[PDB]
């Protein structure tokens, strides 16, 4: 991550770039899997008997 | 007082930022009197009598 100076205009505000580089790689395919159509809003409905 | 260097057009036309910040505080209204309505423009017309 950088950041520097870019100058202040005739507003006079002064201007900051800020900029970060990065990437990623997976080596071998095998490093990665993925489970889709995975479902979040079912609840189950227990059976009660209170005393 | 400040100075700060905002940089260079493609004129080649450099730009600097100048800049004070004041204020002023009256503590108590007894330390401040005014006279107003003061004139400037009138001449006395003194009598003579030469040798």
Redesign the interface.
């Given at each position: 991550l950088s950041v520097r100076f870019m100058?202040?205009?005739?507003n006079?505000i002064a201007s900051y770039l800020i900029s970060l580089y990065c990437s990623l790689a997976v080596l071998t395919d095998d490093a990665l899997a993925v489970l889709d159509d995975v479902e979040v809003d079912k609840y189950h409905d227990y059976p009660v008997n209170y005393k």
């Open positions: 100058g202040i205009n005739r006079a």
